[PDB]
């Protein structure tokens, strides 16, 4: 039971273990972008704005 920071569906978790890499994870998001020609008189361009 301890100090109650674990009351009702929570948990006290050991911080030094998370320091030693406990459950650490990596997250990747890939962003994608397209250079559309888009018809008659417009154009998209990859460049320094």
């Amino acid at each position: 039971s301890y100090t109650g920071y674990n009351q009702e569906d929570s948990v006290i978790m050991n911080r030094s273990a998370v320091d030693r890499g406990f459950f650490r994870s990596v997250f990747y998001r890939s962003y994608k972008e397209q250079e559309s020609k888009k018809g008659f008189d417009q154009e998209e361009v990859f460049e320094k704005p």
Binding site: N14, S16, A17, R20, G21, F22
Partner: protein
Amino acid sequence: MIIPVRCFTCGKIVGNKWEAYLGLLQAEYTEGDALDALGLKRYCCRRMLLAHVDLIEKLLNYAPLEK
């Protein structure tokens, strides 16, 4: 992906005992004795090594370590 330096629960360094262990199992079918010789007394340090899965070995096999 390779055994962690120091066991989570307490701190006793444990990556150093991995290569030694695969040698002991090859020599003997005594997982009890293998863990004992390495000095992994308490079981937190023991679960670490006993429950590890070395994914790195399959992972290295792709030709392109170049990208």
